[PDB]
Structures are given as C-alpha cells and as structure tokens.
Design an enzyme around this catalytic site. Structure first.
Site, PDB file in Angstrom:
ATOM      1  N   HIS A 188      30.284  44.239  46.081  1.00 28.32           N
ATOM      2  CA  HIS A 188      30.709  43.294  47.125  1.00 28.32           C
ATOM      3  C   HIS A 188      30.561  43.950  48.488  1.00 28.32           C
ATOM      4  O   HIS A 188      31.320  44.865  48.836  1.00 28.32           O
ATOM      5  CB  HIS A 188      32.160  42.827  46.889  1.00 28.32           C
ATOM      6  CG  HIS A 188      32.312  41.950  45.684  1.00 28.32           C
ATOM      7  ND1 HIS A 188      33.387  42.031  44.829  1.00 28.32           N
ATOM      8  CD2 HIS A 188      31.499  40.996  45.174  1.00 28.32           C
ATOM      9  CE1 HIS A 188      33.249  41.144  43.862  1.00 28.32           C
ATOM     10  NE2 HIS A 188      32.102  40.511  44.041  1.00 28.32           N
TER      11      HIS A 188
ATOM     12  N   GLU B 138      33.240  45.216  51.220  1.00 25.29           N
ATOM     13  CA  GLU B 138      34.280  46.154  50.823  1.00 25.29           C
ATOM     14  C   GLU B 138      33.859  47.560  51.209  1.00 25.29           C
ATOM     15  O   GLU B 138      33.702  48.433  50.364  1.00 25.29           O
ATOM     16  CB  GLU B 138      34.587  45.994  49.338  1.00 25.29           C
ATOM     17  CG  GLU B 138      34.974  44.535  49.055  1.00 25.29           C
ATOM     18  CD  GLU B 138      35.031  44.166  47.594  1.00 25.29           C
ATOM     19  OE1 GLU B 138      34.858  45.044  46.723  1.00 25.29           O
ATOM     20  OE2 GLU B 138      35.232  42.962  47.312  1.00 25.29           O
TER      21      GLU B 138
ATOM     22  N   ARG C 127      29.960  38.904  51.090  1.00 23.77           N
ATOM     23  CA  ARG C 127      30.386  39.497  49.840  1.00 23.77           C
ATOM     24  C   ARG C 127      29.255  39.460  48.805  1.00 23.77           C
ATOM     25  O   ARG C 127      29.043  40.412  48.045  1.00 23.77           O
ATOM     26  CB  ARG C 127      31.610  38.709  49.373  1.00 23.77           C
ATOM     27  CG  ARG C 127      31.817  38.559  47.917  1.00 23.77           C
ATOM     28  CD  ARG C 127      32.976  37.587  47.722  1.00 23.77           C
ATOM     29  NE  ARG C 127      33.221  37.339  46.307  1.00 23.77           N
ATOM     30  CZ  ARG C 127      34.125  37.998  45.594  1.00 23.77           C
ATOM     31  NH1 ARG C 127      34.868  38.930  46.174  1.00 23.77           N
ATOM     32  NH2 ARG C 127      34.282  37.732  44.304  1.00 23.77           N
TER      33      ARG C 127
ATOM     34  N   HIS D  91      35.741  48.681  44.106  1.00 23.25           N
ATOM     35  CA  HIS D  91      35.905  47.535  44.978  1.00 23.25           C
ATOM     36  C   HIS D  91      37.077  47.770  45.917  1.00 23.25           C
ATOM     37  O   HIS D  91      37.776  48.766  45.816  1.00 23.25           O
ATOM     38  CB  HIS D  91      36.254  46.317  44.129  1.00 23.25           C
ATOM     39  CG  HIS D  91      35.125  45.821  43.285  1.00 23.25           C
ATOM     40  ND1 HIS D  91      34.537  44.589  43.480  1.00 23.25           N
ATOM     41  CD2 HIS D  91      34.472  46.390  42.246  1.00 23.25           C
ATOM     42  CE1 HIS D  91      33.565  44.423  42.599  1.00 23.25           C
ATOM     43  NE2 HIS D  91      33.514  45.497  41.832  1.00 23.25           N
TER      44      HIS D  91
ATOM     45  N   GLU E 241      40.306  48.749  42.652  1.00 23.43           N
ATOM     46  CA  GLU E 241      40.412  47.994  43.896  1.00 23.43           C
ATOM     47  C   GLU E 241      41.126  48.922  44.857  1.00 23.43           C
ATOM     48  O   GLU E 241      42.317  49.191  44.685  1.00 23.43           O
ATOM     49  CB  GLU E 241      41.229  46.709  43.698  1.00 23.43           C
ATOM     50  CG  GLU E 241      40.522  45.671  42.812  1.00 23.43           C
ATOM     51  CD  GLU E 241      39.400  44.923  43.545  1.00 23.43           C
ATOM     52  OE1 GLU E 241      39.219  45.101  44.763  1.00 23.43           O
ATOM     53  OE2 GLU E 241      38.708  44.109  42.907  1.00 23.43           O
TER      54      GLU E 241
HETATM   55 ZN   LIG Z   1      34.988  43.418  45.133  1.00 24.29          ZN
END
Ligand SMILES: [Zn+2]
Length: 303
Positions: A67, A70, A125, A194, A268
């Site tokens: 993505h 990020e 993204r 991410h 994340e």
């Molecule tokens: Zn992501």
C-alpha cells in the site's frame, strides 16, 4: 554511500532504488538486487536478497509498501536493509539467522503507487493498473492474492480503495511475488509490512476458521510485540486478521500460509491514528528500530 544516506526522512522511489544500488556495491558478499518483475507502468520491481551462501536456503520473505501511502513501511525497509548489513557478524542472533537463512526484502512492493504518492496523491494506496470500462485506476494489491479471493472483505467496484481486481494475481506486482516465492520453494516465513494501527496479525483474514498453527503463531506474535514494546513502550495488539480487524479477502499472508509458509505475519506499524499514514519523519527511526526487534523475534522462531 549508505553511510551518508538520511534514514530519518522520507525518500522518493529513485532515492530508494539508488540506496539499494549503493548497498549492493558496499556489500557485494552479503546483498544482491533481484528484479522479480515490472510494475504495471513498467517500473522495475526489486527484491534485495541477503545471504551468506548455501543453495536455496530456507528463506524469509518481507514485503513493504504494497500500500503505497504507508510511507513508514518503505522507510522502515530501507532502515532494515542497512541494519542487516551492519549486524551480520556483529549481532549473535542475526548472524545466526543469516548463517542458516536467506532474507528477501522487497522495500517497494508497489512502485507505481509510491511514485504517485509523490507526484499526484499522497494518500494513494492501490496499484495503477487501468481497469477496462472504468474511470478509475488501481487494485488493492493486498486483496489480489489467491486466498478467499473475491470473497467478502474486498470490493468488486473498480473505484473502491479495496477493489480486488478482476481475478487473483491480476496485478503484476502481486503475481511477481507469487511466481518468485513459488519458484523459490523454500520460504519458511512471509512478513507483510503495512501501516497503521500497531497490530501484529496472523491468518486468516478471509475466514473465521482458526489456523492449525494458532497456538504457536499467537505465542510468536505475543513474543514479537513484547520485544517491540520494550524499546519505546509502543503497544501493539495481535491476533488473527479477522478477529483483530475484521474480514479481509485476497490477503498476502493468508495466501502464503496456505502455501505452507507457516510463519506468516502482517505488521501494521505506527501510529494508531493521530498522524495515521502521515507519520512524522521524526518517528521513522524509532519505528524502524522497535519493528526490527519484533521482526528479529519472529525470525528467531523460524530458524
Ligand atoms: Zn496497508
């Protein structure tokens, strides 16, 4: 040189690619740069392979920036790459890891979106594939994998930020990784990085059924987040994707686990929503550092 490189600021696609060339030049016996494919728009997709030799050694896969917005992830990947070369032969556990395993580090898993986040839209993204019969562009590359593909947890709307594409592996950025991993055949761990939310997640996203390896992966995640936390006090939650953040289909670690890559986790990173994707540069290094401990902790449970 990578010694002159500024790790505490965010960089462009070209600056990161340049960083990779500098690193490969400075460390020819440890790191090489593989092109595993091209992006939709024709940019090279580069994986750095860290290895001390052997043949087809058990391997750890780490993708960052699938993505594009990020940015903390690509920034973390750059930091990781440098740290691998600094710590081999210095750090006992990492030296131990690299002596038995290869690491494959894809810092910019989505080069087209990354460039777009610099040129047009900071919050982009998706990929940049052209969807026939749509005014919209791009697929959520982390909903494009062959794991519960097209199932609830992703969108069939092309303009959606969670659009899964027309069929699994439709995105070259994704097919590239899949073909590489499949052909390599010896991946033991598969880490997707991410941001944001401070989570360490194991499969699945696409189904409520628990993975056979839940007890182990859960303990490993628990260990990892605890190691991560020890640095700056950063608090992560951990659990399956679907119980921690709800249903998500076509995700990478769901795919990899289903390939028999047991140690499949998605990070994340920082923060929890104060700055969100726009995490300040001043947080790059601390994030990198704490995330490293977590990653290293997972690699240790893999060796
Ligand atoms: Zn992501």
């Amino acid at each position: 040189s990578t010694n002159t490189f500024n790790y505490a600021t965010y960089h462009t696609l070209d600056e990161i690619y340049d960083f990779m060339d500098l690193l490969v030049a400075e460390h020819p016996q440890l790191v090489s740069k593989l092109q595993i494919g091209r992006s939709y728009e024709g940019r090279p997709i580069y994986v750095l392979k860290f290895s001390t030799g052997g043949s087809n050694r058990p391997a750890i896969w780490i993708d960052l920036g699938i993505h594009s917005r990020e940015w903390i992830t690509q920034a973390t990947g750059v930091w990781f790459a440098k740290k691998f070369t600094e710590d081999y032969g210095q750090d006992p556990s990492f030296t131990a890891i690299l002596d038995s395993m290869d690491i494959f580090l894809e810092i910019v898993t989505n080069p087209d979106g990354f460039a777009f986040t610099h040129s047009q839209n900071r919050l982009w993204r998706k990929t940049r594939s052209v969807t026939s019969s749509s005014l919209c562009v791009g697929v959520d590359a982390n909903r494009n994998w062959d794991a519960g593909f097209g199932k609830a947890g992703a969108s069939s709307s092309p303009c959606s930020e969670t659009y899964h594409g027309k069929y699994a592996n439709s995105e070259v950025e994704v097919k590239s990784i899949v073909d590489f991993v499949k052909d390599h055949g010896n991946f033991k761990a598969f880490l997707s990085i991410h941001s944001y939310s401070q989570l360490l997640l194991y499969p699945y996203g696409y189904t409520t059924q628990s993975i056979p390896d839940k007890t182990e992966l859960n303990q490993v995640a628990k260990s990892a987040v605890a190691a991560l936390k020890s640095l700056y006090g950063t608090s992560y939650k951990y659990g399956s994707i679907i119980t921690t953040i709800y249903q998500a289909s076509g995700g990478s670690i769901d795919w990899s686990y289903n390939q028999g890559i047991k140690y499949s986790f998605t990070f994340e990173l920082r923060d929890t929503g104060r700055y969100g994707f726009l995490l300040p540069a001043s947080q790059i290094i601390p994030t990198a550092q704490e995330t490293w401990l977590g990653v290293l902790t997972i690699m240790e449970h893999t060796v």
